[PDB]
Amino acid sequence: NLAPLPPHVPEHLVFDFDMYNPSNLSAGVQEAWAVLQESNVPDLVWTRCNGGHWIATRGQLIREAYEDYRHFSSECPWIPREAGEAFDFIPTSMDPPEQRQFRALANQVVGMPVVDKLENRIQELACSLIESLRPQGQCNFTEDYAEPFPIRIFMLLAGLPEEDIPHLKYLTDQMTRPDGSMTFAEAKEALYDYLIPIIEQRRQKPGTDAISIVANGQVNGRPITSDEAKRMCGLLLLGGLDTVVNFLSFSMEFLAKSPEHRQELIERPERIPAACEELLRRFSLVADGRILTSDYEFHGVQLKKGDQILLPQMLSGLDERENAAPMHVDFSRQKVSHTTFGHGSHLCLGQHLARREIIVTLKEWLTRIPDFSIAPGAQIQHKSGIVSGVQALPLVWDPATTKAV
Ligand code: HEM
Ligand SMILES: Clc1cc(Cl)cc(Cl)c1
Ligand SMILES: [K+]
């Protein structure tokens, strides 16, 4: 429950927020986290939960911390601390200057150029998936679309067989939202155990998949180690299975509950992209953090070398000091401001892939199923963690209102 308050942490700045089971969860994860932005909550608080750590509650501080990699190292980026210490993925667990040489190689496998080529294939699967669901007049969105659409595309980029999805997604989720069956340490080992034989195999018969490309790659000219490649592939895997999956569910849930918005995108299709950014702001869902390299006074607070601080990428865009009426989805919002894909040297390499997936989803679903709602009486539950998500989303619609392409 609560870790004893470190001697150096001010008693008045304690706000025991639990990132894996927030108080207000039933109001929605974002509303649960937004409690940290209420009227008398400080810019920086200390929660005694999960072993104890700082939490920056406003975008201005969240932004400076991410920019200041000398004081806030990504080396122990996960909470609780034990997870943070075993977290050795590349390049995420590294800080410039060493981080860069690997970030470039990772960028080559999932970046915009790679996305452009994946284009037609992504669209085909969105359609294949939506049309096949169309005439049923119902589906449980998380397992019938949110998960297979994103993951499949990733399993293809990685050139991995879909039969492995259940195992990999189980491991990934134990990392983002552990249910207790396994520790971060155990989850990563099993993921590292999965990859090893693949990395050695694609290192002898080099294919064109992302795995082969990282396995046979070079960092600023010298050869990548088998181990370096594993730590890098493991992260990509994490980034491919538990990001978009969850975000799509948040967006589609909001759309199921707001006909007005649906209609806006139906009547005015050119707004889909902007709506996509606005949805990313509103339904932001990642929160990881950093560890203090030395003792440092930050915004009037004494941080002690070794303290962990959670910098909720999720919170920036929900900050009223960044966007007025933040909880309000406005597809015409003139300055959509957020840090949903992060901030600093670790900006999300997969945002171009994520945006395309999101925008093709909106376009193709609204085209075939403009009217849909949450199943009657269904009580939607969110889940909080490093990546927040949706437990299930039952959707229903009248087949008669649909249109095949
Ligand atoms: C809605 C979708 C997504 C969101 C909100 C998101 C968010 C983030 C955030 C917040 C970070 C920064 C972590 C930090 O600073 O510790 C990050 C890093 C990263 N993400 Fe994304 N992500 C998404 C989708 C993806 C996808 C589809 C991939 C590709 C598999 C991916 C690959 C990566 C990589 C490789 C990094 C690490 C960059 C580095 O550490 O330099 N992400 N992402
Ligand atoms: Cl820590 C982390 C790492 C990746 Cl790859 C994606 C997200 Cl969302 C968080
Ligand atoms: K570590």
Side-chain angles (χ1 to χ4, degrees), residues 75-77 84-88 93:
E75 206 216 296
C76 181
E85 293 165 342
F87 183 108
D88 64 4
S93 72

Side-chain angles (χ1 to χ4, degrees), residues 91-92 99 103 235-236 239-240 243 288 290 313 340-342 346 348:
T92 321
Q99 180 224 196
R103 185 183 163 76
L235 179 105
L236 288 187
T243 48
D288 73 345
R290 300 290 187 263
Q313 289 87 349
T340 304
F341 287 108
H346 291 277
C348 180

Side-chain angles (χ1 to χ4, degrees), residues 174-215:
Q174 288 331 305
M175 293 183 136
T176 52
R177 301 169 289 288
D179 67 23
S181 46
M182 72 194 304
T183 65
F184 180 80
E186 289 158 344
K188 193 196 53 160
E189 275 22 287
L191 174 57
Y192 280 175
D193 182 53
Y194 168 81
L195 293 171
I196 284 180
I198 293 156
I199 287 179
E200 179 187 356
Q201 279 48 172
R202 265 100 134 149
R203 270 195 148 208
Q204 303 198 196
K205 279 209 62 173
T208 37
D209 56 309
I211 297 290
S212 300
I213 300 301
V214 174

Side-chain angles (χ1 to χ4, degrees), residues 119-132:
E119 192 48 1
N120 295 174
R121 171 91 200 91
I122 292 192
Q123 224 244 169
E124 182 184 354
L125 175 67
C127 294
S128 186
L129 239 21
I130 294 182
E131 168 60 24
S132 162

Side-chain angles (χ1 to χ4, degrees), residues 79 82 97 124 136 188 220 224 241 258 280:
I79 286 191
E82 290 76 21
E124 182 184 354
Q136 290 173 214
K188 193 196 53 160
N220 78 306
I224 199 182
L241 275 51
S258 189
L280 290 158

Side-chain angles (χ1 to χ4, degrees), residues 56-254:
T57 68
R58 303 278 171 179
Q60 174 197 60
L61 277 63
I62 286 156
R63 283 183 162 93
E64 339 190 331
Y66 275 123
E67 284 166 13
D68 182 358
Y69 62 82
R70 273 74 154 60
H71 287 98
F72 302 102
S73 168
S74 290
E75 206 216 296
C76 181
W78 274 43
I79 286 191
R81 183 184 300 284
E82 290 76 21
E85 293 165 342
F87 183 108
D88 64 4
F89 293 116
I90 293 176
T92 321
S93 72
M94 294 169 85
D95 295 310
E98 311 81 17
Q99 180 224 196
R100 252 98 73 160
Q101 71 196 144
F102 300 94
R103 185 183 163 76
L105 171 57
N107 205 24
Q108 282 166 19
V109 294
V110 308
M112 188 83 87
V114 169
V115 178
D116 280 314
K117 332 309 178 62
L118 281 173
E119 192 48 1
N120 295 174
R121 171 91 200 91
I122 292 192
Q123 224 244 169
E124 182 184 354
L125 175 67
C127 294
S128 186
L129 239 21
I130 294 182
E131 168 60 24
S132 162
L133 282 154
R134 192 180 48 71
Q136 290 173 214
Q138 64 171 50
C139 72
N140 191 291
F141 196 74
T142 76
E143 58 194 299
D144 298 328
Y145 190 78
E147 300 179 359
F149 173 60
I151 307 184
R152 275 186 208 173
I153 289 175
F154 177 83
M155 291 300 270
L156 167 71
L157 171 68
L160 297 179
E162 309 187 338
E163 51 175 21
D164 302 354
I165 285 176
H167 176 63
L168 300 184
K169 177 59 174 181
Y170 164 74
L171 293 190
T172 280
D173 298 353
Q174 288 331 305
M175 293 183 136
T176 52
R177 301 169 289 288
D179 67 23
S181 46
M182 72 194 304
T183 65
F184 180 80
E186 289 158 344
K188 193 196 53 160
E189 275 22 287
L191 174 57
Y192 280 175
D193 182 53
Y194 168 81
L195 293 171
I196 284 180
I198 293 156
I199 287 179
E200 179 187 356
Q201 279 48 172
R202 265 100 134 149
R203 270 195 148 208
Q204 303 198 196
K205 279 209 62 173
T208 37
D209 56 309
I211 297 290
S212 300
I213 300 301
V214 174
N216 299 106
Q218 302 200 98
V219 276
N220 78 306
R222 60 84 175 178
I224 199 182
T225 70
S226 283
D227 208 60
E228 267 158 3
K230 168 174 59 69
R231 305 172 60 187
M232 168 166 304
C233 290
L235 179 105
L236 288 187
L237 235 300
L238 183 53
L241 275 51
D242 203 29
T243 48
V244 173
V245 175
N246 293 306
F247 178 77
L248 289 168
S249 271
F250 284 120
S251 308
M252 211 68 15
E253 179 192 7
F254 163 84

